[PDB]
Motif scaffolding. Structure first.
Motif, PDB file in Angstrom:
ATOM      1  N   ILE A  69       0.840  -1.231   0.000  1.00  9.52           N
ATOM      2  CA  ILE A  69       0.000   0.000   0.000  1.00  9.52           C
ATOM      3  C   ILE A  69       0.857   1.255   0.000  1.00  9.52           C
ATOM      4  O   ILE A  69       1.566   1.477   0.989  1.00  9.52           O
ATOM      5  N   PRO A  70       0.810   2.069  -1.085  1.00 10.29           N
ATOM      6  CA  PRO A  70       1.734   3.213  -1.132  1.00 10.29           C
ATOM      7  C   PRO A  70       1.261   4.361  -0.281  1.00 10.29           C
ATOM      8  O   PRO A  70       0.063   4.474   0.019  1.00 10.29           O
ATOM      9  N   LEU A  71       2.215   5.176   0.155  1.00 11.27           N
ATOM     10  CA  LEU A  71       1.946   6.408   0.905  1.00 11.27           C
ATOM     11  C   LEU A  71       0.941   7.284   0.151  1.00 11.27           C
ATOM     12  O   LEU A  71       0.008   7.833   0.730  1.00 11.27           O
ATOM     13  N   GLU A  72       1.138   7.375  -1.156  1.00 13.69           N
ATOM     14  CA  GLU A  72       0.244   8.083  -2.080  1.00 13.69           C
ATOM     15  C   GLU A  72      -1.234   7.763  -1.872  1.00 13.69           C
ATOM     16  O   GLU A  72      -2.087   8.631  -1.988  1.00 13.69           O
ATOM     17  N   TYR A  73      -1.508   6.476  -1.652  1.00 15.71           N
ATOM     18  CA  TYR A  73      -2.849   5.966  -1.536  1.00 15.71           C
ATOM     19  C   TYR A  73      -3.456   6.481  -0.237  1.00 15.71           C
ATOM     20  O   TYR A  73      -4.578   6.961  -0.279  1.00 15.71           O
ATOM     21  N   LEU A  74      -2.693   6.427   0.874  1.00 16.20           N
ATOM     22  CA  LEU A  74      -3.181   6.871   2.199  1.00 16.20           C
ATOM     23  C   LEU A  74      -3.402   8.364   2.258  1.00 16.20           C
ATOM     24  O   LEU A  74      -4.249   8.853   2.981  1.00 16.20           O
ATOM     25  N   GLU A  75      -2.595   9.094   1.504  1.00 17.70           N
ATOM     26  CA  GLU A  75      -2.711  10.556   1.372  1.00 17.70           C
ATOM     27  C   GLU A  75      -4.063  10.950   0.738  1.00 17.70           C
ATOM     28  O   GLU A  75      -4.810  11.867   1.231  1.00 17.70           O
ATOM     29  N   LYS A  76      -4.445  10.216  -0.307  1.00 15.81           N
ATOM     30  CA  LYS A  76      -5.752  10.461  -0.946  1.00 15.81           C
ATOM     31  C   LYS A  76      -6.870  10.205   0.034  1.00 15.81           C
ATOM     32  O   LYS A  76      -7.743  11.042   0.161  1.00 15.81           O
ATOM     33  N   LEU A  77      -6.837   9.051   0.704  1.00 10.08           N
ATOM     34  CA  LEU A  77      -7.833   8.724   1.721  1.00 10.08           C
ATOM     35  C   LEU A  77      -7.879   9.739   2.850  1.00 10.08           C
ATOM     36  O   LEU A  77      -8.925   9.978   3.448  1.00 10.08           O
ATOM     37  N   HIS A  78      -6.724  10.276   3.205  1.00  8.11           N
ATOM     38  CA  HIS A  78      -6.652  11.282   4.245  1.00  8.11           C
ATOM     39  C   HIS A  78      -7.258  12.582   3.752  1.00  8.11           C
ATOM     40  O   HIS A  78      -8.108  13.197   4.445  1.00  8.11           O
ATOM     41  N   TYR A  79      -6.872  12.994   2.558  1.00  7.65           N
ATOM     42  CA  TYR A  79      -7.519  14.164   1.949  1.00  7.65           C
ATOM     43  C   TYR A  79      -9.038  14.042   1.990  1.00  7.65           C
ATOM     44  O   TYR A  79      -9.732  15.014   2.329  1.00  7.65           O
ATOM     45  N   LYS A  80      -9.569  12.875   1.617  1.00  9.13           N
ATOM     46  CA  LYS A  80     -11.023  12.733   1.544  1.00  9.13           C
ATOM     47  C   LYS A  80     -11.669  12.845   2.918  1.00  9.13           C
ATOM     48  O   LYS A  80     -12.702  13.468   3.044  1.00  9.13           O
ATOM     49  N   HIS A  81     -11.058  12.266   3.949  1.00  9.20           N
ATOM     50  CA  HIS A  81     -11.554  12.405   5.315  1.00  9.20           C
ATOM     51  C   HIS A  81     -11.510  13.859   5.805  1.00  9.20           C
ATOM     52  O   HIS A  81     -12.434  14.339   6.444  1.00  9.20           O
ATOM     53  N   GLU A  82     -10.400  14.537   5.541  1.00 12.62           N
ATOM     54  CA  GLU A  82     -10.267  15.953   5.953  1.00 12.62           C
ATOM     55  C   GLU A  82     -11.375  16.795   5.302  1.00 12.62           C
ATOM     56  O   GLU A  82     -12.085  17.529   5.969  1.00 12.62           O
ATOM     57  N   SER A  83     -11.545  16.662   4.000  1.00 14.90           N
ATOM     58  CA  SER A  83     -12.560  17.485   3.361  1.00 14.90           C
ATOM     59  C   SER A  83     -13.983  17.104   3.756  1.00 14.90           C
ATOM     60  O   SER A  83     -14.826  17.987   4.005  1.00 14.90           O
ATOM     61  N   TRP A  84     -14.234  15.806   3.918  1.00 15.80           N
ATOM     62  CA  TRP A  84     -15.534  15.353   4.424  1.00 15.80           C
ATOM     63  C   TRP A  84     -15.847  15.788   5.850  1.00 15.80           C
ATOM     64  O   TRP A  84     -16.894  16.343   6.084  1.00 15.80           O
ATOM     65  N   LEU A  85     -14.942  15.558   6.798  1.00 16.47           N
ATOM     66  CA  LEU A  85     -15.296  15.680   8.210  1.00 16.47           C
ATOM     67  C   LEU A  85     -14.881  16.983   8.875  1.00 16.47           C
ATOM     68  O   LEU A  85     -15.451  17.377   9.891  1.00 16.47           O
ATOM     69  N   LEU A  86     -13.904  17.654   8.282  1.00 21.37           N
ATOM     70  CA  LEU A  86     -13.283  18.819   8.872  1.00 21.37           C
ATOM     71  C   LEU A  86     -13.610  20.106   8.134  1.00 21.37           C
ATOM     72  O   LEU A  86     -14.055  21.078   8.741  1.00 21.37           O
ATOM     73  N   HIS A  87     -13.406  20.105   6.822  1.00 24.91           N
ATOM     74  CA  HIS A  87     -13.667  21.282   6.010  1.00 24.91           C
ATOM     75  C   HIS A  87     -15.113  21.345   5.556  1.00 24.91           C
ATOM     76  O   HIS A  87     -15.547  22.374   5.022  1.00 24.91           O
ATOM     77  N   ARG A  88     -15.850  20.254   5.799  1.00 23.09           N
ATOM     78  CA  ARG A  88     -17.258  20.121   5.420  1.00 23.09           C
ATOM     79  C   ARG A  88     -17.520  20.621   3.989  1.00 23.09           C
ATOM     80  O   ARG A  88     -18.562  21.231   3.710  1.00 23.09           O
ATOM     81  N   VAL A 126     -24.651  16.601  11.143  1.00 21.53           N
ATOM     82  CA  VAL A 126     -24.055  15.545  11.990  1.00 21.53           C
ATOM     83  C   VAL A 126     -22.852  16.033  12.816  1.00 21.53           C
ATOM     84  O   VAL A 126     -21.838  16.456  12.266  1.00 21.53           O
ATOM     85  N   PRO A 127     -22.974  15.991  14.148  1.00 25.32           N
ATOM     86  CA  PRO A 127     -21.890  16.325  15.072  1.00 25.32           C
ATOM     87  C   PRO A 127     -20.620  15.489  14.877  1.00 25.32           C
ATOM     88  O   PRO A 127     -20.674  14.275  14.783  1.00 25.32           O
ATOM     89  N   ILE A 128     -19.476  16.146  14.815  1.00 27.85           N
ATOM     90  CA  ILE A 128     -18.220  15.463  14.574  1.00 27.85           C
ATOM     91  C   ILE A 128     -17.205  15.735  15.697  1.00 27.85           C
ATOM     92  O   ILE A 128     -16.898  16.886  16.018  1.00 27.85           O
ATOM     93  N   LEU A 129     -16.697  14.674  16.308  1.00 30.25           N
ATOM     94  CA  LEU A 129     -15.658  14.819  17.322  1.00 30.25           C
ATOM     95  C   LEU A 129     -14.396  14.338  16.662  1.00 30.25           C
ATOM     96  O   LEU A 129     -14.337  13.188  16.221  1.00 30.25           O
ATOM     97  N   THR A 130     -13.401  15.220  16.571  1.00 28.81           N
ATOM     98  CA  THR A 130     -12.129  14.860  15.961  1.00 28.81           C
ATOM     99  C   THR A 130     -11.200  14.560  17.135  1.00 28.81           C
ATOM    100  O   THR A 130     -11.284  15.201  18.201  1.00 28.81           O
ATOM    101  N   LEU A 131     -10.396  13.512  16.995  1.00 23.86           N
ATOM    102  CA  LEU A 131      -9.508  13.096  18.047  1.00 23.86           C
ATOM    103  C   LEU A 131      -8.198  12.873  17.344  1.00 23.86           C
ATOM    104  O   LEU A 131      -8.176  12.205  16.331  1.00 23.86           O
ATOM    105  N   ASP A 132      -7.119  13.466  17.841  1.00 22.84           N
ATOM    106  CA  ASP A 132      -5.773  13.308  17.249  1.00 22.84           C
ATOM    107  C   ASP A 132      -5.163  12.047  17.849  1.00 22.84           C
ATOM    108  O   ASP A 132      -4.951  12.001  19.057  1.00 22.84           O
ATOM    109  N   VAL A 133      -4.885  11.024  17.014  1.00 27.77           N
ATOM    110  CA  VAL A 133      -4.439   9.708  17.487  1.00 27.77           C
ATOM    111  C   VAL A 133      -3.044   9.330  16.941  1.00 27.77           C
ATOM    112  O   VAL A 133      -2.687   8.162  16.827  1.00 27.77           O
TER     113      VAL A 133
END
Ligand SMILES: O=c1ccn([C@@H]2O[C@H](COP(=O)(O)OP(=O)(O)O)[C@@H](O)[C@H]2O)c(=O)[nH]1
Ligand SMILES: O=c1ccn([C@@H]2O[C@H](COP(=O)(O)OP(=O)(O)O)[C@@H](O)[C@H]2O)c(=O)[nH]1
Ligand SMILES: Nc1nc(=O)c2ncn([C@H]3C[C@H](O)[C@@H](CO)O3)c2[nH]1
Ligand SMILES: Nc1nc(=O)c2ncn([C@H]3C[C@H](O)[C@@H](CO)O3)c2[nH]1
Lengths: 208, 218
Positions: B167-186, B189-196
């Motif tokens: 699994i390349p780093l590239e792939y996880l970066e895309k998935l991370h981008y999608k989560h950030e734009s979905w859950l953070l930048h909207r 639905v209430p969202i609790l972000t937790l830094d893990v």
């Protein structure tokens, strides 16, 4: 609503038959196979992709064909009779089974399909419960000739062996029985000579 | 029953996190991802998870439809079977039909792992399932476990699943981008972000305080 499925091999004459039924009575509607959606998902023709490369595309088609049948049939629910063109049963036990036996689906695809079908049937089985089956029976060779009459581009490569496999599955399910089923012989053109079939249909519906 | 999904990148720590929440309270039950089922295909043999990583242009659509089905099945089963004895019941879904579609499937289409036809059929399939079974599974909140692509990469390495090793780093970066734009930048639905990003296996007390404070408002 009494629910009746019309089953048969490819180009048996089911669309032709059900079109004649449509018009006979204000109390009878038809749920056609949604083939127009399968040939244009502009869009991809998944019916075609399945015929050109069944090892690659069978599961995707089968999945979608099945989904599309249940949607149409559920949507149509809202002396009334509803004629279903094919059914979730022939989806699995005729077509999907044959793709697996043929090695067009592998074990994984086939497990996933059955799991899905099992589940759909649990949830929607009571409502799509058939009161009867009309079986339009035509020899493989007749169906093969009707494929070239109709002239669909997707279906032109179809081997007679394929049709024979499907036929045998119909015979074993509907005839050999290895639900009330009326069997109509549709080997001879019926597009005008259909009066007897309709009386037989009318007489079948009254036994139910 | 409050329904909360736990979202995040591959190997952000959702399983770990969910295992902790399970044990903290009698009124808290979890619905894990069925990765056991995806790893050995059988109905309630084939490793579809692996097939999807070795040949995603071939197996992506098959995995996605199966994953989504198995998710709904799991969530529905827990809804009806769990939490009968609870006073403030909360059911934590590891991921949801939303991330299946809007993160993972979307990303595979975007990456040409599903073609247009596959993508259309999936969306159709997903819309129908969501209509039929969506109101049962509607979320009351999302807990977003945020970890950097780098961190998730090394946790994939730590966990060592064979299927995941290419699994390349590239792939996880895309998935991370999608989560950030979905859950953070909207912007996706209430969202609790937790830094893990820091291990929480033995320092979870204040992650949990955060979860409890989050649940109160719902
Ligand atoms: O008595 C008949 C019944 C059918 N057909 C032709 O056979 C083809 C297939 O019939 P249909 O599409 O109704 O088949 P299905 O696949 O729906 O069973 C079409 O070209 C029909 O016009 C025909 O010439 N005479
Ligand atoms: O605080 C943590 C959270 C996770 N992990 C490890 O990182 C890997 C990925 O965590 P997990 O399986 O829970 O992630 P998921 O894919 O479910 O998000 C596993 O080896 C965990 O043991 C860890 O060492 N410390
Ligand atoms: N593989 C496959 N699985 C099905 O469940 C199925 N149901 C119908 N068909 C085929 C028959 C005609 O070609 C055309 C329209 O009947 O599509 C199917 N093909
Ligand atoms: N393609 C793809 N689509 C999904 O919806 C999806 N959901 C989870 N996963 C993968 C990531 C982890 O390897 C692993 C465990 O969560 O399975 C998915 N992979």
């Amino acid at each position: 609503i009494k629910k009746i499925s019309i089953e048969g091999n490819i180009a048996a004459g089911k669309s032709t038959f059900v079109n004649i039924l449509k018009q006979l009575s204000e109390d009878w509607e038809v749920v056609p196979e949604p083939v127009a959606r399968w040939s244009n998902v502009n869009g991809g023709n998944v019916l075609q992709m399945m015929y050109e490369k069944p090892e690659r595309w069978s599961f995707t088609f089968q999945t979608y064909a099945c989904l599309s049948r249940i949607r149409a049939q559920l949507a149509s629910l809202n002396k009334p009779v509803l004629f279903f063109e094919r059914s979730v049963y022939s989806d699995r036990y005729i077509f999907a089974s044959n793709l697996y036996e043929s090695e067009s689906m592998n074990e994984t695809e086939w497990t996933i399909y059955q799991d899905w079908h099992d589940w759909m049937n649990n949830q929607f089985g009571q409502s799509l419960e058939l009161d009867g089956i009309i079986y339009l029976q035509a020899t493989p060779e007749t169906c093969l000739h009707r494929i070239y009459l109709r002239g669909r581009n997707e279906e032109q490569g179809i081997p007679l062996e394929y049709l024979e496999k499907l036929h045998y599955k119909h015979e074993s399910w509907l005839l050999h029985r290895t639900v009330p089923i009326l069997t109509l012989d549709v080997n001879e053109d019926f597009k005008d000579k259909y009066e007897s079939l309709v009386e037989k249909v009318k007489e079948f519906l009254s036994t139910l």
